[PDB]
Amino acid sequence: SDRVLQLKLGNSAIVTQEAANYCCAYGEWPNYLPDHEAVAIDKPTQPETATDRFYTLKSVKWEAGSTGWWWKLPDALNNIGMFGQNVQHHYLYRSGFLIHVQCNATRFHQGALLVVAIPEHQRGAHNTNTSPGFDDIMKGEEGGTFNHPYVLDDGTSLACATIFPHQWINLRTNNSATIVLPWMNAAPMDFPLRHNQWTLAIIPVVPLGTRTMSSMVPITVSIAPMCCEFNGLRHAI
Amino acid sequence: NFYKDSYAASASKQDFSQDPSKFTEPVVE
């Protein structure tokens, strides 16, 4: 009853048959910006079915010495579809996200994934006092790999990362995880090219293991923006 | 608070509303 799920957004749809109950982050659902919280006075564009639809990132190979993967939002979508064109032509954006993470294997495989969405994941670098530069943070669509996922690459702890909106993909139980993210900012709208607000982290807490034949197990991420507004129309940079 | 600004007041330690279910039960059903 909570294991089958169809997520229809736009011209996209995802069915899954081994799901958990999906996660609404902090009990919140995405909405458009109301008038008593609006700041920018020009009329926003709301390209509803053109941008509020699933976008599927490149799959990553799930291996024995995997540390973990991360994508920063909206940086992982700033060059994809009509979401990316609205990002490049406008100054302000505001959206929630519906993240669906896919990973399946056989009933002889084991492994657990912590699929966690981290708000304002300011990263740190290891064994230096120089801050992480622009190319170390803005990885784009491909995302990055965790250097030290045990501390979440910021001196904190992976053990306490369940305070953040998360699910698990335990291969014994399910093969997908779904997190519904609202707008998470101290600001109503934001400049999407210099600020990331959600980091989707996907972490091998229990590694992949089997004794049957070794197929490739990938992990696929489908991200749907939800309730996109855009202000400040200009040329594309 | 004899000051004219409302942020000048003392600490407000009487906010006993909780909602643990936005962190412990964030699921939709």
């Binding site: 958990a20 109950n21 996660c23 902090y26 920063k72 708000p119 304002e120 994941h121 300011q122 740190g124 670098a125 064994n127 230096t128 006092n129 120089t130 801050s131 992480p132 530069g133 622009f134 943070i137 030290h148 045990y150 501390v151 979440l152 910021d154 001196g155 904190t156 702890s157 992976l158 053990a159 306490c160 369940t162 305070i163 953040f164 699910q167 698990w168 335990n170 399910n174 995880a177 101290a186 210099r194 600020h195 990331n196 607000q197 | 600004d5 942020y7 000048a8 600490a11 407000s12 330690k13 906010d15 006993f16 509303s17 909780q18 909602d19 279910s21 412990t24 039960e25 964030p26 699921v27």
Partner: protein
């Protein structure tokens, strides 16, 4: 559902429960939810009327503690033949909450904070023979980020036509004034996954809205024939606090005030590969009663 909790919850008595289809102790961690198994559902309980108040773990009480944010000893003397980097009877301080790690780790338990800052300035003095301690007058002028900070003790930026100054003596009680919530956003960004400017050579992690301003502190007195070491300590108490989106606490030691870089200690505890100090085996009990 949001409700008002003033004491911890009571316990109901329970009985033998042997019912099919009902497994309160079985849970699904894969959903992302915390276990809802009650103590009445796992073991057989009694009725306990629980009167333990929950008011000390309030976020107001957890954060409204006056904590040290700044500390400068500076030599108070005649500075006509000193270096270029010395504090010539004055100092400037770009206000942050990230220099002293007790307040830093406590504020970094949250992603967003909205609070009024209650600033307490505690000045102490030592003779740099001994002849007595002077009752010196100090000026702490609040210069916002965007204005001009002074370059001398007797510069003419200290006249403070619009900048808010406080004039206080050492023999007085400590100087106390409240700084409001001064962010251009609705909350301060404790963590900022972003870059401060539109070019790609900005600073990572430092939201410019988060910075309060500068705190320029001078000694209004002219110099005596002898020198003194004047130490100024600044204490911040957050108040009228709203907090959002709690975070994992930092386990590794801080390296810098500018970033979340991590090295860890050399061995456990709080090392990069071992946060908890080791034991012999998973079936070894360290403090076992003999």
């Amino acid at each position: 559902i949001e409700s008002i909790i003033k004491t911890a919850t009571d316990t109901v008595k329970s009985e033998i429960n042997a019912e099919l289809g009902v497994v309160p102790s079985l849970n699904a961690v894969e959903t992302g939810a915390t276990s809802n198994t009650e103590p009445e559902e796992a073991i057989q309980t009694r009725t306990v009327i629980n009167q333990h108040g929950v008011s000390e773990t309030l976020v107001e009480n957890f954060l409204s503690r006056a904590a040290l944010v700044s500390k400068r000893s500076f030599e108070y003397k005649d500075h006509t033949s000193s270096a270029a980097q010395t504090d010539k009877n004055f100092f400037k301080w770009t206000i942050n909450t990230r220099s002293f790690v007790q307040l830093r780790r406590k504020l970094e338990l949250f992603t967003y904070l909205r609070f009024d800052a209650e600033i307490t300035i505690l000045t102490t003095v030592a003779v740099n023979t001994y002849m007595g301690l002077p009752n010196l007058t100090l000026q702490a002028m609040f210069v916002p980020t965007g204005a001009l900070t002074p370059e001398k003790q007797d510069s003419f930026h200290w006249q403070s036509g619009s900048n808010a100054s406080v004039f206080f003596k050492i023999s007085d009680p400590p100087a106390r004034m409240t700084i409001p919530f001064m962010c251009i956003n609705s909350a301060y960004s404790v963590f900022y996954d972003g870059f401060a400017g539109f070019e790609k050579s900005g600073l990572y992690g430092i939201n410019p809205a988060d910075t309060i301003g500068n705190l320029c502190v001078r000694i209004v007195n002219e110099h005596q024939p002898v020198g003194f070491t004047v130490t100024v300590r600044v204490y911040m108490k957050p108040k009228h606090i709203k907090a959002w989106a709690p975070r994992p606490p930092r386990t590794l030691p801080y390296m810098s005030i500018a970033n979340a870089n991590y090295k860890g200690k050399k061995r456990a505890p709080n090392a990069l590969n071992a946060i908890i100090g080791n034991r012999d085996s998973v079936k070894t009990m360290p403090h076992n009663i003999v």
